[PDB]
Design a protein around this ligand. Structure first.
Ligand SMILES: Nc1ncnc2c1ncn2[C@@H]1O[C@H](COP(=O)(O)OP(=O)(O)O)[C@@H](O)[C@H]1O
Ligand SMILES: Nc1ncnc2c1ncn2[C@@H]1O[C@H](COP(=O)(O)OP(=O)(O)O)[C@@H](O)[C@H]1O
Ligand code: BEF
Ligand code: BEF
Ligand SMILES: [Mg+2]
Ligand SMILES: [Mg+2]
Ligand SMILES: [Zn+2]
Lengths: 343, 363, 369, 248, 366
DNA sequence: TTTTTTTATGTACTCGTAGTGTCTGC
DNA sequence: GCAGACACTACGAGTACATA
């Protein structure tokens, strides 16, 4: 219930165990390595038998068998590692968890692992009853701007030297995909145990395998950088989200931006953003975005976008995903189109 | 007659040692440095594209982890267990074709042999090729085996589309990513292969084969088998010229370049190529329109795209700036009108012919 | 090349085929593993069936003329050919070129085969502990402690029996977790000490191949395998890695309390206690008083009935040994007439034996609420 | 649901209906485009309650005399209703009262009356389907033929369980093939005399027919390779079956 | 409970003999030549617009293939096999509601039992109707059976359009294109049917029903059955004129001349009057296009008017004299585009108003 | 820090479950 | 006998994918 960060969960792990542990937060790899650290700490301590249970609706609780009966040949305590569903559990499972805690033995440990829960799921009967002694901890992957420091810190922990150019190429190639980042770090360490990597082969042992959620796409398109936007779209290949999500995203911000430009003659852009708290990390990134445009520019953007909107859904076009390449690139160096398209 | 069955060059020239693997310096060197020392993760995931060496490299790890000498980055040459793995039969390596074994009623049984004693030689090691076809419950069984793997065993793993695996097993496995071969790598390897047995070869045929291989080495070997077949035991420029009808790609830019003037036989040759190739005429004209639109974009901006056709950044630019924007707009009007009316022409080839004739009618 | 000649009868061929092709069900990785190896050597037929884990080899006498050779036949098809033929009919077999032809006078079949060289065999080893145990004794050893196996467990070695030997006696450890079981029958001849793990399926096959005959079972245990011989039948099975620890520790060291009652009386009483009102949720709740066993009912459907049993009791009073399922497992396999139970502590486990025999000792740790 | 007219009453032991349905159930259509082909045809005659089932390629007709005057009436009952009716048959002592209507079939068993909806179609004329000339006729032991056909079929083609009879003078030769070529040949001594002939046909169907009737001595009738085979028992003529050949 | 249920004309008068079929002379001649001469084929697909007779031709061919007389060009009609096919009982004519039975599962099921000999007939005809709604897997499943079927099985395909079929199947059958039936054939067939059915009819009413069906026996015959409900027992000219919404009056050319002279008020008044009277709008624009065509044709070549055009020549020739040749084609294109967009308009009257305003926008000076 | 928002119809595959044939030492 | 094994086969659901 404490709702702390794993940098402190390590501290509570070093001290006396605070009964059941619940580590949450959507994690690429940090959840698994935190689980591994918990496993090794427990193995050093009493609890050694890690029984893996997948918490899911429509799946009966075989954990009661461990809960009601104690181990007989090697007790050695034991730990129940629970895997939560990606949407959270239901009331039946939440109350059966409380029943299990009622069946808890002194050598039993409860570990609940999952993603962020809903408020009712968070404040269920089991969590409420365990709020007296259990702990809660959450973590999330670093952002784009927070990546270089994290990568450098991990490199310094692993006793391998990095460089600014190497960090740049890593944060470009592996942006938010820490599993790939960790594998690349291990590969660069094992390839050359010299301990000096500046830019000799870091690209040779690093591919383009990273996640890219749509919110950053306009962040490039608002500068109108042709090569950068084209490279971002090429990076989006092989993890290709269906076009509808990207289309919804850019229609959202373009409707917001056209409303902003309509109201620009009225109350200034900052106090207008006061209504448009879309948390674009300052609401000022949109402020520098709106600096480079024109009303005719917005017309040329919206015509192509709305033509695509019927180009993929009215007749089910197959090039429409590649059309996202077409629409984003043409806006980069189009101050205003002299009609000739006006879709 | 029924003698001299030259089996495929894909199978005959299959690498036997790490020195016979073309390209992929990073994977080779990484595993070489990892084999001398004992830091071996219990599961090695290999991923790449069509026909590169993932399966070959996996055979090489089965060769290396199991030998009389021991765990060696260097090859073995000849020693019983690794000798046995040159052919199919081998006792402590079992190759589960995961495509044929997807259900748990099979893969649970196969993984249930992990707790048996290993056969002759240490490191009971099995190669589950094409892992992306395992069922969800099969992946759960694999995960339960990976979380508490027996120390005396390891097992490799391969795929082609790594995005289909669960994040748990991907995070657990020490994934190596195997890169697509570059054109020079494939060309030199094919040169070596042809020189090895008996077949004469000219260089242009080999550049053409490498270009048409699209990067996969197995693809290059299949095309060299076809080239040998068509060329009657000689891969000369003529058999690969017959292949040139398939590997000839750059066609949409040449017609755009020839539209702005009367080049004579260029338009006729290009339409003959398009008809004999039979590509989508609607897509052909859409590519025409896209090229013309980015040209108009460059007219109002001296470097509007830059990354467009880096190989044609010395000819496309001339028509990107020399041609008046009014002519570009008129050509766009002509091509748009042609596309709008294209399906209603007697034939789409006739329609694209008429679009070209209308474009050539004005200037 | 090879051309073998079978001349056999159904009654002397049906049973070996069953024993060699029972476990061969399902689809194996090598197609040859789905096949049954026929060898005609001297006046002997060797039928081999494998699963990369256990080999069944049946020997059949060939009184009628024959020709040596080796081939492999689809097991299901050959068994269905031999089955269904008229009783007492003679099967003759000639393997010509590629195909094997079977004949029963008015019937002829042509079955496709696979070369005998492709068939895998298990390499020879040294059998450390070789003995000729009485078949009935081995049957008792398996049955008195086989009900507790813990199949499909994370330990990946708890799934198999353990066999331990000392001098002229041996024991079978039923590694289960919350259950333990051991059985102390003699061998009659001195054997060295050896601990061996045998998989669950191997145990099932080894107890099935007994057939309840009189022929002693010749069992050879090596470093990485075991072999069993009964009559003209041979069974081979690999071993599991990992060693199960000592089992005598789980035994109650100081059983302050003892109970004793007729085997049939306890059987009926606990059968009722398990079927009357204690089915799913925990179940029985035990209260041991002087010559009294008070059983309380707990079930999801809230049928709560209390029953008192008259069992001879040495002690004052105790509670909280009520693990119904495992004590049922013990009771069904007791094979006793009068049963004596040792209880030391509620937290610790409970031992069960015969009142006048130690043919099977059971250890069950009760569950707490 | 209300009562119906055109309602003839039946009085018959459940064993009679069980024998009838068990005689003509294995040859009833299952999810076929011919919608009337599903279910069984119950036809009333002054002699028996004849029943007809067909897939278009297995025509099984059973005729158990009932001993009551029956106005001529032809009914088709769907697959579901037939299966349920067969499930409700047991005992063999209670008299089953079958009540036919224009659109429904009711039946009184013991103390319960159950009803089933009735397929709307016009069933084919089975008598024309039955061959018009039994010029080539043979008799053979029922269990012998059944055993021989099982033996031959164990190597038959999996998807198309197809064997071939070769009928010569007092001899039946069964020949079966399959992918992954395997040949099964079996010779039976039969009571046949006539023209030499070969005919390919499904073996699962014939095994099913022999399983259904299971008499002492069967006899089949047939003319030519394309001609369908009409199999019945040599004791009586109450049950007849028609199997359509493979190949052509 | 009438005779079965086909008291409707659409089912009662489907032909039972090649002699009884109307039009389709080329395909009937081809089928008769194939049947009699011996050149037979295993797969015919009849493609044509709706209500032309591809299903009927297919069933009649199935009759002709399995008549006890032999492979006869004209089916017996009285023999037992023809009667059974008429009843639908015939166990070798396997009709398929391929629009309803689309799953590849059922196609595979019906292909597994193709090897069986026919129960009674010579040929096991697989009549498939509405083939174009087979799932792609079903189309490709039919391939190796369509190409080389056994000697005894013949396929019939009856699809509304041929171009939706894969080019593989389209290249393995005889494509018989059923030519759409012209007005005279429809009129003669309708008159013969009505004379057989003993209900009085007027020739001009039949002409209306023919010209409104756009070449379809089923469509025209359904329209006649609709008129019988309206016109009591008789297909009378007045009743069918009111039902069909024909432009009996002369307001068509009146609003034509109002529109070409940019008289917006007059055009709107005429539209309001027509809507009040209860006009139909698609026929209005069809008449517009016809009148414009006549005006243009006499603008090029005089003395081209006929009957009613030759009577209203006093106005038509004046319009051809005053309207330039270039503007006539533009008016015609605008009117036909408006007719194209009539379905894509929430109100038909509003769509016609939109079309007329688009036309008047050519010369919107006043 | 919680934030918008495409379908119908069809085809496969794999995992439970459920119902049923068949038959084996019990 | 025979019920329980034991197999085997069919059906629904959940999921992944395709194409118009
Ligand atoms: N690194 C390599 N060295 C030599 N041959 C290779 C290499 N990679 C691919 N090949 C060729 O391609 C064929 C198939 O290779 P394979 O390793 O199966 O590719 P994949 O990664 O797609 O499974 C091999 O037989 C070999 O001829
Ligand atoms: N060629 C024709 N000859 C006679 N009647 C026809 C003809 N074509 C259509 N019909 C009439 O149309 C009705 C439906 O015909 P049908 O053959 O089903 O057309 P479709 O090709 O659209 O399925 C028939 O019942 C018949 O009255
Ligand atoms: F075998 Be590879 F993945 F094409
Ligand atoms: F086109 Be028809 F109405 F089948
Ligand atoms: Mg591969
Ligand atoms: Mg039709
Ligand atoms: Zn070696």
């Amino acid at each position: 219930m404490i709702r702390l960060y794993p940098e402190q969960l390590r501290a509570q792990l070093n001290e006396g165990l605070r009964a059941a542990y619940l580590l949450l937060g959507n994690d690429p790899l940090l959840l698994q390595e935190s689980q591994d650290a918990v496993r090794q700490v427990a193995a050093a301590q009493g609890f050694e038998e890690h029984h893996t249970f997948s918490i899911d609706p429509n799946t009966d609780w075989n954990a009661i068998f461990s809960l009601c009966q104690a181990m007989s040949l090697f007790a050695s305590r034991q730990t129940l590692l629970l895997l939560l569903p990606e949407n959270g559990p239901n009331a039946a499972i939440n109350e059966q968890l409380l029943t299990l805690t009622g069946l808890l033995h002194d050598d039993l440990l409860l570990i609940v692992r999952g993603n962020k829960l809903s408020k009712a799921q968070e404040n269920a009967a089991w969590f409420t009853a365990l709020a007296n002694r259990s702990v809660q901890v959450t973590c999330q992957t670093p952002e784009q701007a927070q990546l270089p420091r994290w990568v450098a810190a991990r490199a310094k922990q692993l006793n391998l030297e990095l460089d600014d150019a190497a960090n740049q190429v890593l944060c470009y190639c592996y942006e938010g995909n820490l599993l790939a980042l960790a594998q690349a770090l291990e590969r660069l360490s094992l390839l050359w145990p010299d301990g000096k990597l500046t830019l000799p082969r870091v690209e040779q042992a690093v591919n383009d395998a990273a996640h890219f959620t749509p919110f950053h796409w306009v962040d490039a398109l608002l500068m109108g950088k042709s090569k950068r936007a084209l490279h971002i779209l090429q990076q989006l290949r092989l993890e290709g989200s269906e076009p509808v999500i990207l289309l919804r995203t850019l229609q959202r911000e373009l409707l917001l931006l056209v409303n902003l430009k309509r109201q620009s003659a009225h109350t200034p852009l900052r106090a207008l953003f006061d209504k448009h708290r879309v948390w674009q990390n300052r609401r000022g990134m949109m402020g520098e975005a709106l600096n480079r445009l024109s009303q005719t520019q917005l017309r040329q953007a919206v015509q192509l976008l709305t033509r695509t909107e019927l180009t993929l859904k009215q007749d089910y076009g197959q090039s429409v995903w590649a059309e996202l390449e077409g629409l984003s690139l043409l806006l980069c160096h189009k101050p205003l189109a002299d009609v000739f398209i006006d879709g | 007659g029924p003698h001299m069955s030259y089996q495929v060059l894909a199978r005959k020239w299959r690498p036997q040692t790490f020195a016979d693997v073309v390209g992929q310096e990073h994977v080779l060197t990484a595993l070489a440095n990892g084999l001398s020392l004992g830091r071996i993760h219990h599961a090695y995931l290999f991923s790449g594209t069509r026909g590169v060496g993932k399966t070959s490299i996996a055979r090489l790890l089965a060769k290396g982890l199991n030998c009389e000498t021991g765990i060696t980055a260097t090859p073995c040459g000849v020693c019983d267990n690794c000798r046995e793995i040159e052919q199919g039969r081998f006792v402590d390596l079992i190759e589960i074709d995961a495509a044929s074994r997807t259900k748990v009623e099979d893969t649970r049984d196969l993984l249930d042999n992990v707790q048996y004693a290993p056969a002759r030689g240490r490191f009971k090691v099995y190669l589950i090729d094409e892992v992306h076809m395992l069922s969800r419950h099969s992946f759960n069984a694999l995960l339960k085996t990976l979380e508490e793997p027996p120390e005396h065993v390891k097992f490799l793993l391969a795929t082609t589309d790594p995005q289909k695996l669960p994040v748990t097993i991907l995070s657990r496995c020490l994934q190596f990513h195997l890169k697509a071969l570059d054109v020079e790598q494939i060309r030199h390897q094919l040169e070596h292969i042809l020189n090895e047995e008996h077949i004469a070869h000219e260089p242009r045929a080999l550049q053409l084969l490498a270009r048409a291989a699209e990067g996969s080495l197995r693809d290059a070997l299949s095309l060299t088998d076809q080239a040998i077949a068509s060329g009657d035991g000689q891969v000369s420029t003529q058999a690969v010229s017959a292949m040139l009808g398939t590997l000839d790609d750059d066609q949409a830019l040449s017609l755009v370049e020839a539209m702005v003037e009367a080049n004579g036989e260029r338009v006729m040759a290009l339409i003959n190529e398009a008809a004999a190739r039979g590509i989508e005429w609607e897509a052909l004209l859409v590519e025409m329109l896209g090229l013309l639109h980015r040209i108009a974009m460059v007219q109002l901006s001296p470097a509007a795209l830059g990354n467009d056709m880096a190989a044609i950044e010395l000819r496309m630019r001339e028509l990107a700036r020399t041609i008046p924007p009014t002519d570009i707009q008129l050509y766009y009007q002509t091509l748009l009108i042609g596309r709008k009316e294209l399906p209603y022409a007697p034939d789409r080839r006739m329609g694209v012919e008429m679009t070209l004739l209308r474009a050539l009618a004005f200037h | 090349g090879p051309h073998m000649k079978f001349t056999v009868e159904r009654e002397h061929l049906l049973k070996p085929l069953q024993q060699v092709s029972g476990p061969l069900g399902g689809r194996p990785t090598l197609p040859i593993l789905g096949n049954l190896l026929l060898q005609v050597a001297d006046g002997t037929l060797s039928l081999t069936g494998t699963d990369l884990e256990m080999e069944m080899v049946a020997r059949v006498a060939l009184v009628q003329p024959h020709e040596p050779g080796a081939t492999t036949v689809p097991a299901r098809k050959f068994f269905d050919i031999c089955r269904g033929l008229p009783e007492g009919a003679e099967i003759a077999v000639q393997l010509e070129g590629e195909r094997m032809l079977v004949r029963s006078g008015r019937s002829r079949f042509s079955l496709s085969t696979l070369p005998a060289a492709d068939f895998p065999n298990l390499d020879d080893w040294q059998s450390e502990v070789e003995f000729t145990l009485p078949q009935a004794t081995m049957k008792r050893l398996i049955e008195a402690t086989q009900f507790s196996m813990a199949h499909q467990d994370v330990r990946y070695y708890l799934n198999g029996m353990l066999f331990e030997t000392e001098g002229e006696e041996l024991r079978t450890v039923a590694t289960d977790g919350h259950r333990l079981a051991v059985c102390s029958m003699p061998i009659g001849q001195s054997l060295p000490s050896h601990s061996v793990i045998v998989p669950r399926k191997g145990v099932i096959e080894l107890m099935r191949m007994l057939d309840g005959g009189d022929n002693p079972l010749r069992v050879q245990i090596g470093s990485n395998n075991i072999r069993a011989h009964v009559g003209d039948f041979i069974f081979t099975s690999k071993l599991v890695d990992g060693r199960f620890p000592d089992y005598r520790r789980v035994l109650p060291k100081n059983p302050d309390k003892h109970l004793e009652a007729g085997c049939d009386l306890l059987k009926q009483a606990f059968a009722r206690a398990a079927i009357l009102s204690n089915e799913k949720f925990r179940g029985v709740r035990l209260y041991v008083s002087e010559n009294q066993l008070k059983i309380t009912a707990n079930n999801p459907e809230q049928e709560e009935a209390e029953e008192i049993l008259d069992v001879t009791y040495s002690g004052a009073e105790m509670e909280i040994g009520f693990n119904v399922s495992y004590v049922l497992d013990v009771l069904n396999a007791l094979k006793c007439e009068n049963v004596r139970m040792m209880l030391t502590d509620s937290v610790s486990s409970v031992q069960i034996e015969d009142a006048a025999s130690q043919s099977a000792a059971y250890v069950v740790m009760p569950m707490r609420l």
